[PDB]
Amino acid sequence: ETVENVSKESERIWRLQRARTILEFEKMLPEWLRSRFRMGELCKVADEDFRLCLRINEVKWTEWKTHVSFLNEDPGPIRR
Amino acid sequence: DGLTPLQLAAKMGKAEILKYILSREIKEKPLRSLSRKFTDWAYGPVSSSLYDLTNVDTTTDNSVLEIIVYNTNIDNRHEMLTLEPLHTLLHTKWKKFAKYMFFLSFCFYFFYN
Amino acid sequence: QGDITAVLIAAGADVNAHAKGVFFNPKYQHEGFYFGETPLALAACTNQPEIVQLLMENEQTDITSQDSRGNNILHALVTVAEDFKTQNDFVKRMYDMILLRSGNWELETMRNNDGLTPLQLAAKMGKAEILKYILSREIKEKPLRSLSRKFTDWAYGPVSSSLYDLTNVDTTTDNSVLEIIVYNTNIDNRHEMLTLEPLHTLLHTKWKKFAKYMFFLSFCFYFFYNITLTLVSYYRPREDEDLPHPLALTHKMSWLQLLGRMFVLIWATCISVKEGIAIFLLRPSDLQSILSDAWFHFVFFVQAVLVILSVFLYLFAYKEYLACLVLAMALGWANMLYYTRGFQSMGMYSVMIQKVILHDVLKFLFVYILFLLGFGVALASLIEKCSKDKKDCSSYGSFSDAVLELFKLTIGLGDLNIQQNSTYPILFLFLLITYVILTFVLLLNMLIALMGETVENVSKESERIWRLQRARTILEFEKMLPEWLRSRFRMGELCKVADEDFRLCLRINEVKWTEWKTHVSFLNEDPGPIRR
Amino acid sequence: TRGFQSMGMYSVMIQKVILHDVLKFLFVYILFLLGFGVALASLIEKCSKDKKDCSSYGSFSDAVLELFKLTIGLGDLNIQQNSTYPILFLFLLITYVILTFVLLLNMLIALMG
Questions:
Q1: What kind and span of H or E run contains C465?
Q2: Contacts of A6 in chain C (CB under 8 A)
Q3: Which residues lie on this side of the membrane: Cytoplasmic (chain A)?
């Protein structure tokens, strides 16, 4: 199963050995971390809109449920 | 040991329960202040999701990625970095910080030899 | 909300509205979700089949209205259905439902702003599964079967002769389907489309009647072209003085070389004519296909022009009489690999060569030089500071000489720098055997780089590339002789539906057992090859 | 070689490969053998010394054999008795030696699938 396991475990070791150096290059320059990105602490629940820093991902088809869970009035990349 | 439960799931590396804590959608609104995922758009097939990122990134002491990657002693470690609030975040800094710093460490060390 | 929808339509809400907002997003996979701007397509795209049937009972509803992009509705359903089979397949079901609820033929003829039929749009974006529906489309009725694309002719149990319909498919008009499919870049499931039946046999048709007989003539003409270039270096009168003429004019008898030396220079013009067109057409093809195909048209052009450029150099005498010829002559026998198309047996062994040079040889090469440079410096600094052969080394390259004495052990060696050395010269057989084994693991591990479902994927992807690289040349040999296309075959426009029997040109295929249905769909009175 | 089920399997696959893959190997291998040979045979006398010491046999084909035996067994003096920067004579062998090897390694995959 070198056909199977070895060319899969090489994926297992390589993504880790990349991931070690990236966290090392965070800790290598503690000078000016101005380009850490955080989406700028949008609203969570309450009147406390400035709450905690977030991130963004996107989804696709398969089981079109209805919707009351959202936050906004179907906007886009709302820059204004 | 001074550990949050999210930290305890990482430090022992029990992966499947950590898939639940970082996802955690709660489809209500008397108590959805406990969630960790947020859906923003409601537009049929496309929808922009918001993961929550409190202790995850290395912004405080003893964060999640600091626990996961530097650790020994666990064996399913690559099966944890598939998980979405970690998989794209490593990919984030490889676009903006690391890869541009990486080849400078190559090209400096290349002329050294 | 279909229940709220009923009151809104009863109140008189406009149903032919548009929407031209910022939410189109040409960077499609975020913030977008294209419609086709109409309320009808939004009902269609998002699986509201009750509402799609609801929106067509209203007489005020238009269908033929277009988009800002020019799209009608059946353009839009094509631009949504992605490459995933049976995702509770609804686009194939609902593209069906819009035509059968209403429509004459005047829906599939309208062009977009890019000037494309919906059949062309499915090909140019390459969304394969919905194109399987359009080219099949049997309609087992007869009030409305003038929209079909398949026709069954015989009704005779297991055997049945089918008729595909072939309107815009063959390259008989401008911008046809095969011209779109094969010449295109930018798509990745391209071989999964040429499995489909009104294309799979049609490529096979011209390889019986046009291309294969034209192909080996292009081989046998190009084959003798390289022997004639070869026979100025063999040159059976073995030596005369020093040969001051590579490609001469030979004012002398035995015209076999007079016809011979002129036979080279004529074919250098034809390749110069034909592949000078390669700039005029292939402006995005080369940089996008950086590792795939259509590069040999440059490499034929590098070869044949340098044959003439030696002959221009022979009258201006920059000393490169023989120099420009020979180090460009070698491509003439190397470019023969273009003709390795032609056998399915030969094609598989042809593709995988260029597979490994791009994948794994350069992966092999960067590490192999890194150890070759590695252990060489330890031995090159060994060769003179200590380790005798004291005075006997005054020949060449005191660093690089030791590199070659470490380089040839890969290939062929056994020499005296072991026997003519010092500083305990068994040490000189430590710092080779660290090299010899460490080549071998870096050589053995390249086998594993040709593993990893190479059993599965590689001998399947070689089928994926080979059928395409045949299919490019066949459509090129259509366009190569526009002289007399009398042997394009069409079955001669048999009856479609109406009193218009001379209707449109067709084709023939045949079927087999499994689910003996009954038959009212046919055309004739169970005939055979009815010649009469 | 009929007679053992053990011996029979090794007997059939010989005639399998001569019909399938050796002739697939042979047509390409001669195509490069004829390929790099002409560049070296036209090298051997017009430039690149061993000036007078070449009056033996087949000025084209002699260079072919000096490129043919590297597949089998060689190590000879037409490197050491050459000119026109004779390291170049170890470029236009190593283009051949590697390009045999991929055409030899890919025959393993022709015995895969």
A1: helix C459-478
A2: 448
A3: 9-80
CA gap A66, B31 in Å, rounded? 20
CA distance A70 to chain B (A): 5
Map tokens 């001469």 to a residue: C248
| Cβ count near C19 (within 10 Å) | 14
Do chain C and B touch: 3 or more Cβ pairs under 8 angstroms? yes
- What distances in angstroms separate CA B80 from CA B15, C14, C83, C151, C293, one per listed residue? 6, 52, 29, 55, 39
CB contact under 8 A, A12 and B78: yes
CA of residue C38 relative to chain centroid, distance: 37
Q: Distance (Å, rounded) from C-alpha B87 to C-alpha B59?
A: 17
Looking only at the bridges linking them, the beta strands covering B37-39 and B48-51 are antiparallel
Q: Write out the two tokens for C489.
A: 């075959």
At D101, the amino acid letter reads: F
For chain B, the C-alpha Rg in angstroms (whole number) is: 18
Dist. CA C23–CA C30, nearest whole Å:
9
How many Å apart are CA D16 and CA B89, to the nearest integer?
Answer: 53
Phi, psi of C265 (to 5 degrees): -65, -25
* Alpha carbons C312 and A60: distance in angstroms, whole number: 63
CA torsion A14-B109-B90-A45 (nearest 10°) is: 160
C-alpha C133, offset from chain centre:
24
**What distance in Å separates residue A14's CA from the closest CA in chain B?**
9
C31 and A76 within 8 Å at the Cβ level: the answer is: yes
Residues of C in contact with A77 (CB under 8 A): 31
Token output for C33:
């979700």
Contacts of A54 in chain B (CB under 8 A): 38, 50-53
Rounded CA separation D66/D52 (Å): 18
**CB-based burial label for D65 (10 Å; 0-12, 13-18, 19+):** middle
The beta-carbon contacts of A27-30 under 8 Å, at least 24 apart in sequence, are: A27/B58, A28/B101, A29/B101
If you count residue pairs, one on B and one on C, with CB atoms under 8 Å apart, how many are there?
Answer: 11
Strand partners, B37: B51
Instruction: Give the resolution in Å.
Output: 4.3
Q: In what order do the strands lie in the sheet with C150-152?
A: C150-152, C161-164, C509-510
DSSP labels, D19-72: IIIIHHHHHHHHHHHHHHHHHHHTHHHHSSS--SS--SS-TTHHHHHHHHTTTT
C192, C128 Cβ separation under 8 angstroms: yes
**CA angle (C260 as vertex; C259, C263 as ends), nearest 5:** 85
Helix (H, G, I), strand (E, B) or coil at A41: coil
CA distances from C470 to B55, C190, C204, C334, C355 (A): 57, 13, 10, 20, 17
Rounded to a whole number of angstroms, the CA Rg of chain D reads 19
Measured between alpha carbons, how far is C337 from C351 in angstroms, rounded to an integer?
Answer: 10
Are D28 and C349 inside 8 Å of each other by CB? Answer: yes
Q: Which residues of C31-52 are buried (b: 16+ CB within 10 A; e: fewer)?
A: bbbbbbbbbbbbbbbbbbeebb
Q: Are C169 and C198 in contact (CB under 8 A)?
A: yes
Q: C19 and C37 in contact (C-beta within 8 Å)?
A: yes
Distance from CA of B22 to the nearest CA of A (A): 13
A chain contacts of residue B84, beta-carbon cutoff 8 Å: 57
Answer yes or no: are the C-beta atoms of C491 and C505 closer than 8 Å. yes
CA distances from C206 to C294, C475, D32 (A): 21, 9, 32
Counting Cα atoms < 13 Å in the Cβ hemisphere of A56 gives 15
Distance separating alpha carbons of residues C330 and B44, to the nearest angstrom: 60
Q: Which amino acid is at D1?
A: T
